[PDB]
Subunit: 146 residues, 4 copies
């Protein structure tokens, strides 16, 4: 019944993507600030169920972009070998802060709520390409904040 | 009691208008962008219960207008013969995109929510001339988006 | 003239290894605590002159070991293709702390000073397989500390 | 100066309505007798400047009404295409006489004079919605008679 989520940033309990074992997988990451390639080495980390780094996707070529950006992952590790099927965490690091020596952070399952959809009649949040149930949301706040 | 819908664009499960068999029928369509008559041929499509084109109403004369616009349909097909009574889908195409070669789209039962009305005490959305129950809404988003 | 460095841990200004473009390269890393493979994912990171991750060497198979351990790097990246010649930083992460969520850290060019050598007559520190001049040392402290 | 026209039926030299080429047009017809839909097929005829039948508007739905009745014409012909701008004659046929096999007749620009208006100070006849100058009247007689 509540549509006030629209325009807010949402944090969800979804931090992974299912890889079926064979088909390439699509995902969206939300960048709160404009990506600056001169600040550190910005990159996506794909991790398996035991937090082992399976693939790094460099973000330097996406300099100047912000908000939702769409990506693909073939399901290969750095060697090029197809990984076991399962749930894979996708996070990112970008814009290394000169003073604090820390990167800004984003991940799959967070970002601006762009629309609310009633699926006869359960409510759902459109967050880029992800469509998630309301119950999955664990925090809301306005853009440029927290 | 959620009034957060006000100012959002709503999509509803109402896509048709009832024609009684005889009387002319009034309806409202919501144009998200200003109608440009130089871009393609803009027009309304009236379709029967089996998606058969019954009438086309040209929109070229409404150049420069936007938002809710009101129209009438006499209940006649292209020949001028009164159609069977029943439920008729009303959609429209306007502003042929030069690059993508696609028209922008609107239809009956969507548009800006202008007010919320409590009908002692069931809530209702004023969407131009249409006043619809809350349960009919299947999606919300901000203007200029999706 | 000072032999008091022997038995201390030394930190040096050497953090890289030169790769000639073709030949495999040997290096030593000093593990202050016993490597625990159940605590996170322990691994070596090989980074190029611009801090880009070129190779990850997993340390899980070295569970239970401590102190100096020797390794080889063929000069290939994760795909198996020989990298440009140049200076490559070699660091490692091991033993993820359960409470603080941080890994212990080591790198090339630090560890226990095992002997002091007078090279007629400049003094030199034997630090595992590395033999470095005294002037390269930037910090000393006792084992189990800092 | 003469108000004796009030209550009489007037015939005027106005037999047409101007259509601008685009906007729907309003007009009033005077029915001397109550419209009986069972007696023939009662209808309005809209004729161009050369007496060509352009539109027929059926009067069956106005059964039981009498006197002035207001109507609209969109400016379309029977096919639904907008007609050239110009002057259009509007007449009607109703109540087919069983004996004589003839319809009763009315047209635009005739009917009961309901009031006389002095427009500082030229006199004017209110004839339903039409307000016409005195000089336009070409005949007067009492109701029920000719």
């Amino acid at each position: 019944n509540s549509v006030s989520m629209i325009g807010k940033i949402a944090e969800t309990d979804v931090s992974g993507a299912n890889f079926d074992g064979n088909n390439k997988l699509s995902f969206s990451l939300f960048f709160d600030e404009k990506i600056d390639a001169s600040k550190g080495v910005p990159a996506i980390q794909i991790l398996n169920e035991n937090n082992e780094l399976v693939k790094t996707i460099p973000l330097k070529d996406y300099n100047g972009q912000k908000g939702y950006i769409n990506f693909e992952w073939d399901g290969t590790n750095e060697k090029g070998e197809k990984v076991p099927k399962g749930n894979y965490k996708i996070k990112a690091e970008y814009n290394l802060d000169s003073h604090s020596k820390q990167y800004l952070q984003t991940r799959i399952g967070r970002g601006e709520v762009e629309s609310v959809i009633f699926d006869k009649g359960k409510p759902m949040l459109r967050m880029g390409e992800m469509i998630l149930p309301i119950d999955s949301a664990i925090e809301f706040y306005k853009p440029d904040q927290k």
